[PDB]
Amino acid sequence: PAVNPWDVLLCVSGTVIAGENALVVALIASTPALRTPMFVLVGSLATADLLAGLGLILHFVFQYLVPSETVSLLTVGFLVASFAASVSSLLAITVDRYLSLYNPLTYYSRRTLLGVHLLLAATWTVSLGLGLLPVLGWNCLAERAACSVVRPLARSHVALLSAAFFMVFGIMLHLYVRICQVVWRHAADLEDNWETLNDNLKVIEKADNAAQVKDALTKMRAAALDAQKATPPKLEMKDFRHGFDILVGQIDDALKLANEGKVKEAQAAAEQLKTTRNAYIQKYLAHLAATRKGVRTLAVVLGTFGACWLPFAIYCVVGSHEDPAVYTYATLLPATLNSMINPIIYAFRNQEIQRALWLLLDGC
Ligand SMILES: CC(C)CCC[C@@H](C)[C@H]1CC[C@H]2[C@@H]3CC=C4C[C@@H](O)CC[C@]4(C)[C@H]3CC[C@]12C
Ligand SMILES: CCCCCCCC/C=C\CCCCCCCC(=O)OC[C@H](O)CO
Ligand SMILES: CCCCCCCC/C=C\CCCCCCCC(=O)OC[C@H](O)CO
Ligand SMILES: CCCCCCCC/C=C\CCCCCCCC(=O)OC[C@H](O)CO
Ligand SMILES: CCCCCCCC/C=C\CCCCCCCC(=O)OC[C@H](O)CO
Ligand SMILES: CCCCCCCC/C=C\CCCCCCCC(=O)O
Ligand SMILES: CCCCCCCC/C=C\CCCCCCCC(=O)O
Ligand SMILES: CCCCCCCC/C=C\CCCCCCCC(=O)O
Ligand SMILES: CCCCCCCC/C=C\CCCCCCCC(=O)O
Ligand SMILES: CCCCCCCC/C=C\CCCCCCCC(=O)O
Ligand SMILES: CCCCCCCC/C=C\CCCCCCCC(=O)O
Ligand SMILES: CCCCCCCC/C=C\CCCCCCCC(=O)O
Ligand SMILES: CCCCCCCC/C=C\CCCCCCCC(=O)O
Numbered sequence: 001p002a003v004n005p006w007d008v009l010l011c012v013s014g015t016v017i018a019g020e021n022a023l024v025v026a027l028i029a030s031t032p033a034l035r036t037p038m039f040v041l042v043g044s045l046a047t048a049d050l051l052a053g054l055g056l057i058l059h060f061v062f063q064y065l066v067p068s069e070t071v072s073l074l075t076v077g078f079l080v081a082s083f084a085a086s087v088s089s090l091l092a093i094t095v096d097r098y099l100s101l102y103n104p105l106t107y108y109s110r111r112t113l114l115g116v117h118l119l120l121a122a123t124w125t126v127s128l129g130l131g132l133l134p135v136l137g138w139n140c141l142a143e144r145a146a147c148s149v150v151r152p153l154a155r156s157h158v159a160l161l162s163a164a165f166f167m168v169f170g171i172m173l174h175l176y177v178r179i180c181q182v183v184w185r186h187a188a189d190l191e192d193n194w195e196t197l198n199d200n201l202k203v204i205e206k207a208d209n210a211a212q213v214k215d216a217l218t219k220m221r222a223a224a225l226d227a228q229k230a231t232p233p234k235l236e237m238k239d240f241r242h243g244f245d246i247l248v249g250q251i252d253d254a255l256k257l258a259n260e261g262k263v264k265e266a267q268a269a270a271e272q273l274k275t276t277r278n279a280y281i282q283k284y285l286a287h288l289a290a291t292r293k294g295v296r297t298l299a300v301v302l303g304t305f306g307a308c309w310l311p312f313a314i315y316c317v318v319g320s321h322e323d324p325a326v327y328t329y330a331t332l333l334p335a336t337l338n339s340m341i342n343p344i345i346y347a348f349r350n351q352e353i354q355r356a357l358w359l360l361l362d363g364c
Contacts, residue, residue, distance in 0.1 A: 004325070010060065013053075017339045020344075021342075024046035026360075027360065028347075031356040044120050045090060045346055058075050069141075076151075076152065080131035080134065081130060085127035088168065089123065093346060094179075097175075097179060098178055101182045104233060108236040149316060186291075193223040194223075197224060200219045201277065214266075221248060231244075254270070
């Protein structure tokens with residue numbers, strides 16, 4: 001028993017990672033529709049995870065099948081660059097999601113596409129550099145007292161890697177809270193205006209004087225428009241939104257009658273407003289149910305990223321080369337599992353990626 005079980009587990013993990021992310025890469029590459037900034041970023045993440053998966057397999061190969069210290073230095077440097085590129089790609093994705101939420105219009109501009117190009121060129125340039133430094137000689141091959149828990153990386157180089165991870169993670173947390181903030185605000189405004197919409201509709205049905213009817217119709221018009229704004233836009237869906245378009249229209253019809261002195265007729269028009277409102281009551285509950293689920297996903301995915309990488313990042317600066325290798329393996333394996341989760345969260349859950357997959361399975 002000279003093969004270490006953990007090395008086999010990493011090879012298995014790398015195989016799953018490579019297979020998952022190779023499929024994502026193939027789907028985006030062969031689908032001209034998937035060329036927006038968002039998908040350029042997903043393709044970068046998938047490529048990095050693909051490279052990291054292959055790297056785990058290669059590390060096994062040149063440890064056990066072609067024993068080579070030199071090529072093992074290359075494989076570890078390869079993995080440093082691949083995981084750096086994956087973590088930095090997650091940062092870039094998060095930046096993009098922030099910008100699309102905070103700039104519902106100016107996000108769709110030439111600057112945004114330029115920004116992804118420059119950001120990815122920079123993250124990949126830095127990622128490669130980080131893996132190239134040990135290959136060029138910033139390693140512990142000469143001085144074994146300077147070895148980190150991941151051979152043959154030098155403790156000082158690994159400290160830099162962990163510092164970069166902590167900074168990247170801190171930025172993601174900042175963006176996460178801002179994203180969370182915007183999603184909560186819009187959901188709160190939608191639920192507010194929807195409730196006031198219903199309140200005034202009851203005022204109409206129970207009105208006893210004409211002043212109440214006009215007042216309630218005036219508030220319904222404002223609430224309808226505010227509820228529309230809080231709904232995310234179609235693109236660059238708008239069916240739930242267009243439900244408010246015909247509500248404003250009906251409210252304007254009732255207001256016209258009320259202003260001409262036909263308040264009885266304006267009140268009776270609430271039956272039609274209640275009919276309209278009831279038709280979109282499910283789309284409203286479904287939208288609130290989707291945002292709720294999305295918020296949960298946000299936190300779960302970021303928490304899982306932290307649970308997978310933080311123990312490793314911490315142990316890499318606290319541990320030393322004297323520790324048994326199992327503690328490096330036990331903290332490294334979860335970090336690799338995150339590269340199995342990434343394609344599911346950022347690629348396979350996307351409807352356009354699923355469509356490309358359907359066209360691929362069905363022979364186009
Ligand atoms: C040690 C490893 C990391 C070296 C990797 C070298 C090559 C293969 C890397 C470096 C930069 C990478 C590119 C950077 C960004 C993108 C955009 C993405 O939408 C598709 C993949 C693509 C086009 C990558 C393809 C692979 C790539 C060219
Ligand atoms: C020996 C171990 C097994 C190695 C062998 C399995 C490797 C699977 C990896 C990636 C497959 C997903 C990427 C390929 C997806 C198809 C590429 C494509 O676009 O094909 C279009 C064509 O119409 C259809 O063949
Ligand atoms: C991250 C930056 C570093 C990335 C580095 C990627 C380098 C890959 C390039 C070429 C393949 C080289 C393959 C070398 C195959 C060597 C086969 C061999 O003979 O090596 C066994 C040797 O004899 C034992 O004694
Ligand atoms: C060895 C090197 C290690 C480096 C370790 C540190 C990593 C973090 C550095 C840069 C990421 C910057 C990402 C962009 C930050 C957010 C930009 C943003 O939100 O602003 C966009 C602006 O508002 C548009 O108008
Ligand atoms: C989302 C999933 C997140 C998963 C996060 C996992 C974090 C694992 C961290 C520590 C486990 C350490 C396990 C160490 C097992 C040691 C067994 C033992 O006794 O070691 C023998 C050794 O020779 C005597 O030093
Ligand atoms: C989806 C792919 C299937 C994954 C199955 C899991 C792969 C398990 C591979 C290696 C695990 C090694 C188990 C360790 C055996 C005991 C080792 C020992 O006692 O020395
Ligand atoms: C044996 C060395 C291990 C490295 C293997 C390298 C093979 C994978 C390299 C790149 C795959 C990424 C291809 C990206 C295609 C995207 C095209 C597009 O976005 O339009
Ligand atoms: C593009 C698919 C992924 C390819 C990289 C991962 C799989 C491993 C591929 C090749 C491993 C063998 C490399 C060549 C070994 C030569 C040994 C020798 O010449 O003595
Ligand atoms: C993408 C950039 C990659 C290179 C970044 C570094 C640039 C500076 C040039 C050379 C320094 C790299 C080598 C440092 C370790 C030397 C160890 C030694 O000589 O024994
Ligand atoms: C802002 C981009 C900067 C690009 C240039 C960066 C150049 C980096 C060069 C060297 C980094 C430090 C390398 C340390 C080598 C130590 C060698 C050893 O310990 O034996
Ligand atoms: C995130 C900051 C922590 C430092 C990151 C280090 C990145 C190294 C990545 C892959 C190298 C994996 C090599 C295989 C583990 C062997 C462990 C051992 O030395 O016994
Ligand atoms: C998740 C919270 C993010 C907070 C980021 C704080 C800034 C992090 C920057 C540097 C800290 C890492 C320095 C590690 C040095 C260890 C050296 C050693 O003992 O080998
Ligand atoms: C048994 C399949 C495991 C599936 C993934 C979960 C990983 C944790 C379970 C087992 C780890 C591999 C076996 C540990 C070998 C102990 C000997 C050693 O430390 O080198």
